[PDB]
Amino acid sequence: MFSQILIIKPGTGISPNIIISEDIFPVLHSLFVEHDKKFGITFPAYSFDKKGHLGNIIEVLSEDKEALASLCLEEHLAEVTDYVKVKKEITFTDDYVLFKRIREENQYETTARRMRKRGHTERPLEMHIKKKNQQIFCHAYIKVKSASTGQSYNIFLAPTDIKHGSFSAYGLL
């Protein structure tokens, strides 16, 4: 489907990850919440070696050649331009590896509270947190702040093989 490719300009001091997290996410999520129809996000350079990176490059994907123009890409990112360039041609294509959202247990105290009142009252838990968190953590992230809960959380990512489907507000499957 149609797509608009996003560079971060390289060799500027700041890392890709920081620039991607702070700039691109907030404005894309605000635009995504606004224009309700679920768009999609793909990273053309995922390269999991022992841990997993995210690359210089991201792709916004959608299935309407005018919906991308309804997002007004190159005029929204008009402050931080020195670190981001937004190409302006919504070219269709049929090659991509879509991504999803992996989750990660939660700290022992926050599980406990639910773990007691919910019932199922009173070391087996700690093994579950340690194993489940240790397995996942070695993937990529995109630190996220909050508008409501006003909290800091990290949204991990991982590939999949669906090649079509229905997406979410942040951008994954």
Partner: protein, 292 residues
Amino acid sequence: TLKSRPENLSFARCLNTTEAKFWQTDFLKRHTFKLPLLITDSQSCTLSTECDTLRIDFGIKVLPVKESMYSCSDYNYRTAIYQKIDEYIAEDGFLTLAKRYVNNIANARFLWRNRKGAEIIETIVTIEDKEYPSFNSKSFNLDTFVEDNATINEIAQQIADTFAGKREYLNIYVTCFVKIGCAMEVYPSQEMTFKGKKLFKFEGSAGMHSQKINNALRTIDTWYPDYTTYEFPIPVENYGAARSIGIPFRPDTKSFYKLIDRMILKNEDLPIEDKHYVMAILIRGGMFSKKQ
């Protein structure tokens, strides 16, 4: 009659940079008021609740190039180097490289990471007892090198003449004013205490190591082989090795070692770009020797 480089050849740096010390101030009273900015114990660093500006102060000393050889175990090769530098001082009076250095001062590349999200940045440069008109620092880009400003020319002429003999030293002092806002992080440098992010402290306050400020001002190389594909300035290194994009950008014939072997050990007129890279590598310094 020259067959090889000597067994001991070294240079010194002709651009000496001091370490930076961080201060905090307000903005509409910046020319009357200063306060210490300290580390809060992993370590961290943040502004107060009543200030909205970070002031960064450092200074530069410029030295001549010809009188900056520290060791040469063969007089003939010294005579060759001195004649080649005199040939470049005939063509270009070291103006292009110095213009690029003052441009890297004016773009405010020395505020790495501390530059994203600023609202107004200004930079004043003082030489002797005369202050120079300030710089907007966001009307400049990190891809282009302006060559038609007035103050940049007027500073680069002084730096030039001193890289070439007509003055013996030049002391340049630079102050900066970054408005990030109240209660925002600072990002000073980091120490290899070699756990936790141990931050650097200079005289109680915070600051950057002088090597980072120097590596920001030597990103002037736009004369490498594959520049049309990747269009971005790289630091002036030997086997050109910008660490961000982890691939050597000059592994081969255009390296400094080969290029200086093909200019002293066998007379051959290089293009002006290659001279502009070699005379720079010499401004930086190193142990350019051999294993005879």
